[PDB]
Structures are given as structure tokens and as C-alpha cells.
Nucleic acid binder design. Structure first.
Lengths: 60, 206, 149
RNA sequence: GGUCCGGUAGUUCAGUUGGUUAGAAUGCCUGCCUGUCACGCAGGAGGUCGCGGGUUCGAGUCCCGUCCGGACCGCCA
RNA sequence: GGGAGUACGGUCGCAAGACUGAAACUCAAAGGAAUUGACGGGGGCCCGCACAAGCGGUGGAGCAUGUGGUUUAAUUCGAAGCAACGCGAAGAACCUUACCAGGUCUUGACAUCCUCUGACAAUCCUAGAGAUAGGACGUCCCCUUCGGGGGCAGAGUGACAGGUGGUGCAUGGUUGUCGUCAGCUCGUGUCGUGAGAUGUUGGGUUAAGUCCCGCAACGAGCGCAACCCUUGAUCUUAGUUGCCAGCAUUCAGUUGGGCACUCUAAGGUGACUGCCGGUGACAAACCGGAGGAAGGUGGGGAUGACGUCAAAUCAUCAUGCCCCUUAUGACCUGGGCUACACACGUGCUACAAUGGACAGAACAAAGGGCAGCGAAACCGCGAGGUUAAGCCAAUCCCACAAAUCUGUUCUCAGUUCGGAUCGCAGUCUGCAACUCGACUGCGUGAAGCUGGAAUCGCUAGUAAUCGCGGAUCAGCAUGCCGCG
């Protein structure tokens, strides 16, 4: 059961509290980064692919 | 425990992001519509085949460049079709868009095109042995320095899966100076799921 | 593998005696800096008061008193775990003796640290102190098991 | 049928005599050890004394009876 | 091959026993030699905080969190030695959230097709939780030679949609582990008959299958190294929001003036065994010097070979079956994942005078800040509130880094240590703080006075301490990530 409450996330809830954040490309509710509205799995995917113009594999 | 993605590692040092626009406070939605248009054009050009598409931003006007020689054939007959589809991109993006078609000469050494070739040969019932062993030498005589290609899944022996790969040439993955282009593709079969991974050593960079 | 070593807490190179070597550097092995270079340098003056001579001389005199010259380690042989006497390197000597002074200073227990330490420095300048006590117990253990080479 | 013994932790035996203290192995429990188990190492709980009655400031341990078993005797024509 | 050199009958022997020697039944192997790995309480070498040699810890107490057990209506599922157990969760009052009780719906929030109504919605009213009864304006576009199309929603509609429902021993795609260990292979050729061997062994060498020297081997590939990032010395360019050497000025090195210096960020220099002596055959290399900011892969990061563990994930993905669509699919209210007789793992706080308390004096990263950061002043002894300057940030703010140094008191106690748990009274956020937040003022003040058997991390900016930010996001950090 995923489509129903991704649709819940899409529609505005009855209170300003309830609008939790789900990742938009892949509907995981946990561990999204606000700067991309993306969660780690499908974030790392297109990160290795090349998207997200500014980010690189870091090292120091 | 498997290897890091080679282009994933090489981005930004020897490879460009294929999304060459700066944003700030609009990064999330710019990125989102970039994925949306990527998905749309890949879906609707899969038959014609295309490897990589770059996106560029100017005055809120998106502009695109799209690869592979077959969209070259989409220039002539599909020249009407190019406008027809880019109308859809205009509708999606809200603000109107520009496009460009760049021809990849020598398609035998593009990773994604090779992967799509292998995926199609697999899905139309050809044996992995013939397909892969023929494609490797095709690319080699096309003039790569080294190739390694790999398929996995229920390889005919449906009751159990396994892994297999062929290669002939020089292919350094640990060196951060090579130009190891990488791609992967998914092939759905009746007896299960088949995945493909192909990369080629083109040359070093200086 | 192989031997390795370092030097630190170095005083100045020239026109340096041991007394000012320590009066500007050295030892202090009690914890982080501060609460040392302090709780010390004052222990010495209280014993300038408590003895009518240079408070440094009693320090290394008590040090000489505490120094061992043999000790014993443990070796696995058959089912006995024989205690084997061995010697002490010139630096092992100093580190372990100093260690005994400091740990017993923080063990003995009186009103406060600097008087504790000073009382032990004099109880080791005289040959009746807790650290010296362990020194002779290690020694009698050692040459009671001298036979083992 | 008579005489003599005894009956205690879940099991086996001290105490049971010292009227004024309930103990020792095994078992069991927790932890550690070992990849796991077993050894092994730390720790810990237990019975409140066959049953009933009585003396005594006080009965496990004194005196009675009842149950339980065990030892011995049950012979002369 | 067992049955068995046993059974029976004989011949010997005093005896032990010896010689002769069946069968029934039962199995498809039992064996010889060689080959490759594994393993040995086998040998010869070598390595690693592996052990020694040191520091401080874990369990003994309180609490934070995770797990087992039990408990329930549910305590949602996944994870199970190293390599699960402050793990999926970079955040559970509702939401998340699946599970439980109750109340509810059916082509269904969600997607494409078919026919209509044409553009369709929102606000407010009683029951109200969904939702339904109906309302007050109350279903209102672009093109159309006007036929009708395009998109927009609404209704009906049958195909269909839904599966965080199972199966990681059907898979993809990912990830851990041995392991940053030094190995793992092939081309061609040789030897063997064949499993196979050589190269890949032997001398040293290093971290290395690193290199050199021999060698039926000659080469190549994946591994190692380097190429990458970052910190260490400096040259050129650039001096604003930085820096103020010399000057006038100031409490506001802010101004005036100037890139002197730092600093900032681009391009080079740089350390390459380069050079000298010795060792070593002269080779490879190793030892010691000098230059040198840096000498022998300077430091650290990124990089993780062929593969084993049917290692983990059906919670992103899809054959496979079943669940049906008047139910495992869906909407709402409340409860739970926080329960609590106990057990374990990982952490924070202590157990005190190298200390507590009070006052003064300091030194300073790397990051974040627009439904944001939020200055100053005033209010409250406080959590905070009022009105708010500046800042889209080398300008403003978050942001008064603590440890530390100095001085006063305390005088060894279950204490002025410890602060647990409690009742009272408040602040903040959020509709909402009972289950079930954090913070603060009171009152309270528990156990604990260095922790059995055992056991862990750490080779110098490390451990040990001390703080400071940051993802998650309204609030929720003793966790994690990062900084000094």
C-alpha cells in the first residue's frame, strides 16, 4: 500500500502539522534531504548517473 | 561488496554532470523537472535509441542537447515530429524550450547504446553467448582499447541464476585518469529478470 | 617491526643543569597541562621550607633511592608460569620509578596533592616510603627467583 | 509378634550431642568463557527438621505415642 | 566389499588355539597411485593495537537508547557471532503507521480507455470523525465556414487500479564480510597420458605478484603503485564585504588612504632515491648524511581484484501463485510501536579537594540562515515575551566556544560531591503535551565512596578530556555526521 498515501502526501491535509515529507522520485517517507526533496536510495542513483548539477563524491 | 560506479566516481573531474545549470532556491524543482523531461524523452525515444541528454538553463528558458545518430533520422522525417514532441516539453515545463541533436558517430563505443543493444538482443530470444561474444568484438574492431561486459539473472537455466562476463583488452578501473564510460540496462524476460552492465576503456585524458 | 623512540619535554641546550631542566620542563606526568606546572613548582618550595637546603637535591636523591636495578617478568613454561628476573634499561629505570612516585602520591591520601607528593619525596629521600617499599619487594622477589636467568 | 535403630535443601550425608546458630557436596538459576555445547570461572536461592502431643526461658537435637522403612529374634518337644 | 578366516564337520594341541573352510542375507561400491585445495596440538619464514609495554574504559549504581523474554486488542514488520542488537529510523502526541478496536466506501484517492454536462469549483450552516441531508452566488475556458474539435473538471460505465500480502533458496539493482589482505587469472608454448604442472617457483627486496638476478618458459590482464581530493613552504595575479606596516583620527584600524602583512582562490614551484659515503656483485634495493617547509608510499581521505558466506534487502523491481475488488483494496476517530515480573548490547552522568561553589580575565573552528537568521533596547531572577535594525550573507545574525589562568570560601563527610525519582508553579511549539515533548523556578534529594569472573579502543595532534556547529525539522539527540 503506497499509492494511497503518496496521494495523501500530494493533497493538503487538514492541519499544517500533518504534511510530512516523502521523497518525490521514489516514495520513501524516511530520510529525505530538503535541499533536493530526495531520499538516499534514488538520490545516490542519479548522483552516480550525473544529475544534481553541483555535487561530487567528496573526499578530504 | 561490489565496486563503486566508475562514472559515478569520475564525474566532475574528467566528466561533466550532463546537467550544466546553476540554481539556488530553485534547485529542487529545477532538478525535478529535469528528471521529468529526461524520463519523458527517454520513454518516447527508446525505439529510436538515445544515450545521454544534457540540460541547460538561461533566463528561465530550458534548452536541451540530445545524442545518437538515430535522432539524426528523426531530424528529417521526424522534423515535424521534433516540433511535435518539443511542444509537449513546452507544455510540461510551462516556459518554452530549445533543443539540439548531436550525432554520436561510431555508436559501437557508447556504453548506453551498447547496453540497449544487448538488452534488445536478449529480449528477442537470442542467446546471451552469441549476443555478448559478438558485441564485444564488434566494439573492439570499432576501435576501443578494452571492453568488459556482464549479464546476470536466470540465464536460460531458469531454476537458478548466475553471473557471467566476457572481456578482451586493457580496462583499468582503479586508475582515475582513464575514460571508462559506463552504462547498464534492464531486460525483462519470460523466465525472470535480466540485467546488463557494460563499460569500455576509450583512452586516458591529458 | 623494530625499535622506536622519541624525546620531548626538552629544556634548553646549553648552560643547563638538571635543576633548571625540571624548573622549566620535564616530568609533569600527572594529566593534562595545568594542574601540573602547578600543584608542582610549589611542592618544591614547601620542602625548601621543610629542609634547610636546595629543594631540588632531595628530589633526585629520593629518585636514586627509588630506582630499581633488577625486576621480573612472567613467562609461560610447562604449567608453572615461572617468574624470570631481567634487567632494566636506562630509560625504563627512570620512567618506572617516576611512575611509582606519582601513582603512590595519588594513592597515599592526605589533605591535598602537593603536600602528598612532597611528603613522599622526602619519605623516599629517606629510605622509608611506600614507593621504596614496592622497590624492595620487587627486588627481594627478583633475587629470590634469581636462578632462572 | 517382640527388641533396637533411624526418618533433615530437589538427591546424598553432617548438625542430630552443645536444648538458646539449620550446615557440606550434588542439583538448579544468573553472568563470563566457546562459533555452539560440554568442562571451567564468578556469583545466588533453598529446606525451617516424618507426623501428633507434652516438659521448658527456649526443642531440630529432651520425653511420649502414630506412620514409615531398616537390623536382630521368633527356640525345646 | 561385508557377512568371516566367523559358523558347521574334521585333523592336530593338555590348553590357549592352529590348518582346512561354506552359506543365508546385504551394498554398489570397496580399493592402488597420483592431482588440486583445505586442515595439523607439523616444519621454515614474514605481517597486523594481534600479543607484550602504557593510557582510559565496559560491566558495580542512576538514567538514555536498541534487543531477548513476557504482556496485551495491538505492542507493525526487517535485522540475529565476528559481519544483528543509539541497526532500516538523518527524529513515532495525530500525521509517519503497516498494526488493534470502532465507524464507514466500492471501477474505488491514485492510471488509460467509453458516453454524457458543459469549463469546474470554493466559502459558510445542523449531526459532524469520516461522510452524508440539503442548502445561500451556488457547476461561469481556447479555437471554431458554428459541424464540431483541444483541455478541463464532474457524472455513469466495463475492461481495470491495489497490494509496506508471501516467496532474497526465482532475480535484477544495491550493500556487508574475509580485506586495502596480496593475491587471482588468461594468450602462446612446453612436460605429463590424465587429474594437472610451468609462467605464478628459487636469492634478496619492500607494504606489496615491488624490483632486480636466475630459471621452459616468453608475455598480457585484474589486483599493488601512481594518475584524484585534502593539510603541510613558497612564486605570479587579484585586493572587497578582508588585512591596517607607516600617518590624522576614534569606543565603533569603523573612516581617510594602501595591498605593506595575513587571508582569500586560480595557475606553477615543490620530494623525484634527486645528490654524497657505506652496505650490497656493480643489480635491486637497505643504512647514515646533507641540503631541505617537508627523505625515503611526509600525514590523512577517495579507490575495495577473482570470489566464499543460498550473508542482508521482494519495503525501489519484476515471471511466479494465491487476496479480491460488497476485501489482505480503501477513508476517519481513538489506541501503538514508549507495555514491564527480568536478561543482554551500546552510550551519558557521577562516585570527588588534580574537587564543588562565587567573582574576574581570557584564546576561538568549520558550518547554517528567506514561510529563514533574527540585532539593539525594555519586561521576567527563567524557560521566554514585547517592539523589532541589519543580513539573501569574507558585510548582518545564528555566535557571550568551554576546558583554561587569577582570586575568596569550603575542609573529607555519603559531604556545599552526586543528581536520580518525586509534589507545586510556569515558558515554548503545535488544533492538540494523560497514555506521550523539551525547557525553566521552587521544594525535594535516591543509589553511588572506583566496581567479581571476564572484556574493549588507542602508536602523538593519536588516546584522554573540553566544548562548537550540522542532516533529520514547528518540538523532540546522552545518538549520528563534522569542526576546533
Amino acid at each position: 500500500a503506497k499509492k494511497s498515501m503518496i496521494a495523501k502526501q500530494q493533497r493538503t491535509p487538514k492541519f499544517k502539522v500533518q504534511e510530512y515529507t516523502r521523497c518525490e522520485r521514489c516514495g520513501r517517507p524516511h530520510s529525505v534531504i530538503r535541499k533536493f526533496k530526495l531520499c538516499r536510495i534514488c538520490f545516490r542513483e542519479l548522483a552516480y548517473k550525473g544529475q544534481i548539477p553541483g555535487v561530487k563524491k567528496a573526499s578530504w | 561488496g561490489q565496486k563503486v560506479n566508475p562514472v559515478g566516481l569520475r564525474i566532475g573531474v574528467i566528466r561533466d554532470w550532463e546537467s550544466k545549470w546553476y540554481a539556488g532556491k530553485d534547485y529542487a524543482d529545477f532538478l525535478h523537472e529535469d528528471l521529468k523531461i529526461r524520463e519523458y524523452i527517454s520513454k518516447r525515444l527508446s525505439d529510436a535509441s538515445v544515450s545521454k541528454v544534457e540540460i541547460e538553463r538561461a533566463a528561465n528558458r530550458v534548452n536541451i542537447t540530445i545524442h545518437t545518430a538515430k535522432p539524426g533520422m528523426v531530424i528529417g522525417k521526424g522534423g515535424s515530429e521534433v516540433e511535435a514532441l518539443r511542444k509537449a516539453l513546452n507544455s510540461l515545463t510551462g516556459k518554452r524550450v530549445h533543443i539540439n541533436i548531436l550525432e554520436i558517430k561510431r555508436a559501437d563505443l557508447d556504453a548506453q547504446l551498447v547496453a540497449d543493444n544487448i538488452a534488445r538482443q536478449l529480449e528477442n530470444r537470442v542467446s546471451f553467448r552469441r549476443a555478448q561474444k559478438q558485441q564485444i568484438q564488434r566494439t573492439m574492431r570499432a576501435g576501443a582499447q578494452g571492453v568488459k561486459t556482464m549479464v546476470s539473472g536466470r540465464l536460460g537455466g531458469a531454476d537458478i541464476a548466475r553471473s557471467e562476463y566476457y572481456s578482451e583488452g586493457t580496462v583499468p578501473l582503479h586508475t582515475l585518469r582513464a575514460d571508462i564510460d559506463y552504462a547498464t540496462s534492464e531486460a525483462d524476460t519470460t523466465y525472470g529478470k535480466l540485467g546488463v552492465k557494460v563499460w569500455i576503456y576509450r583512452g586516458e585524458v591529458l | 617491526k623494530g625499535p622506536v623512540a622519541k624525546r620531548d619535554v626538552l629544556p634548553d641546550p646549553i648552560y643547563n643543569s638538571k635543576l633548571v631542566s625540571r624548573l622549566i620542563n620535564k616530568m609533569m606526568i600527572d594529566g593534562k597541562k595545568g594542574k601540573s606546572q602547578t600543584i608542582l613548582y610549589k611542592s618544591f618550595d614547601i620542602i625548601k621550607e621543610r629542609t634547610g637546603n636546595d629543594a631540588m637535591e632531595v628530589f633526585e636523591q629520593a629518585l636514586k633511592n627509588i630506582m630499581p636495578v633488577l625486576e621480573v617478568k612472567a613467562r609461560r613454561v610447562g604449567g608453572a608460569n615461572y617468574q624470570v628476573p631481567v634487567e632494566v634499561r636506562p630509560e625504563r629505570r627512570t620512567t618506572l620509578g617516576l611512575r611509582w612516585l606519582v601513582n603512590y602520591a595519588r594513592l597515599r591520601g592526605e589533605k591535598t596533592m602537593e603536600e602528598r607528593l612532597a611528603n613522599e619525596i622526602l619519605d623516599a629521600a629517606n629510605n622509608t616510603g611506600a614507593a621504596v617499599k614496592k622497590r624492595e619487594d620487587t627486588h627481594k622477589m627478583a633475587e629470590a627467583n634469581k636462578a632462572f636467568a
